[PDB]
Amino acid sequence: SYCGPCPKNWICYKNNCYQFFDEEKNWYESQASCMSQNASLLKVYSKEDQDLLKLVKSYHWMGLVHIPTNGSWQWEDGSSLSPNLLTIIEMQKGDCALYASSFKGYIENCSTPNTYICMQR
Amino acid sequence: ESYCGPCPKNWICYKNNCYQFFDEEKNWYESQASCMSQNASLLKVYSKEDQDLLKLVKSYHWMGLVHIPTNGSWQWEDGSSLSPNLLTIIEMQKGDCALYASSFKGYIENCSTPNTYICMQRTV
Numbered sequence: 388s389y390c391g392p393c394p395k396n397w398i399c400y401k402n403n404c405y406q407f408f409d410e411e412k413n414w415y416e417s418q419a420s421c422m423s424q425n426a427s428l429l430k431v432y433s434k435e436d437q438d439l440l441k442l443v444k445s446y447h448w449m450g451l452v453h454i455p456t457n458g459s460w461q462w463e464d465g466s467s468l469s470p471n472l473l474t475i476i477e478m479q480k481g482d483c484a485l486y487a488s489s490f491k492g493y494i495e496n497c498s499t500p501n502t503y504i505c506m507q508r
Numbered sequence: 509e510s511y512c513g514p515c516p517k518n519w520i521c522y523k524n525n526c527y528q529f530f531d532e533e534k535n536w537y538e539s540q541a542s543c544m545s546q547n548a549s550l551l552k553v554y555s556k557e558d559q560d561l562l563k564l565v566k567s568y569h570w571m572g573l574v575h576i577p578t579n580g581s582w583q584w585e586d587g588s589s590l591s592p593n594l595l596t597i598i599e600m601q602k603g604d605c606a607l608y609a610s611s612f613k614g615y616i617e618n619c620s621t622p623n624t625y626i627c628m629q630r631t632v
């Protein structure tokens with residue numbers, strides 16, 4: 388069976404498209420980058436459908452944003468984080484999060500430059 | 509925007525090649541057998557441009573490159589020759605097998621030492 392469709396130089400896995408970007412940018416720059424490729428930052432919605440994320444090395448911006456006037460974490464598209472997907476770990480005071488294996492999110496200052504993962508589907 | 513495949517459903521697809529990582533440690537022969545059982549072979553490096561994803565592969569993993577001591581040449585398990593300009597082969601341990609390491613390096617290793625490995629299917 389075929390996987391996709393996905394941009395030419397992207398990784399395809401269970402019909403989701405992923406791309407790693409090694410240029411370090413703040414969270415806002417990274418979101419803008421994925422958007423310019425008609426994608427978004429990594430969104431984690433299923434350990435089963437996205438089990439390749441166990442294989443990811445290093446730490447990378449994903450699309451999770453913290454709403455301080457709530458107790459809320461949400462994805463870019465406004466959807467909620469569902470249960471048993473990410474272990475959220477304090478690291479720095481901030482409103483953004485870095486993905487790390489295995490299915491961890493480290494709270495990070497949105498202004499700090501990091502590598503990032505875009506995702507499309 | 510195109511499709512990638514054909515591949516098995518739980519394999520990674522990149523530029524119409526299928527990849528799978530296995531973190532169980534096996535000697536070279538058992539690693540090759542495991543790839544073959546899934547209609548695949550150990551990693552073969554044929555193109556820096558079309559396999560540039562290999563720049564992101566960390567640590568050391570079996571690939572399908574073997575040594576013919578009687579002639580000193582390196583070749584892939586299927587008998588095909590190693591293209592120039594692709595891999596830098598570096599001594600490590602006395603052996604007739606090679607581990608892939610980034611970036612586009614081959615480290616000589618004892619074929620009987622268990623290591624993690626990478627399987628690959630071409631779709632030609």
Ligand SMILES: CN(C)C(=O)[C@@H](NC(=O)c1ccccc1-c1ccc(C(F)(F)F)cc1)c1cccc(C(F)(F)F)c1
Pocket residue numbers: 398405406407439440442443444445504520529561564565566567
């Ligand atoms: C053995 N090993 C498994 C690695 O070295 C590992 N390296 C890094 O993840 C890796 C290493 C360094 C920098 C970035 C990454 C990386 C980040 C995100 C993605 C993403 F875009 F895909 F999200 C892919 C790679 C790996 C290599 C190739 C493919 C994959 C996989 F994730 F696609 F499966 C993982």
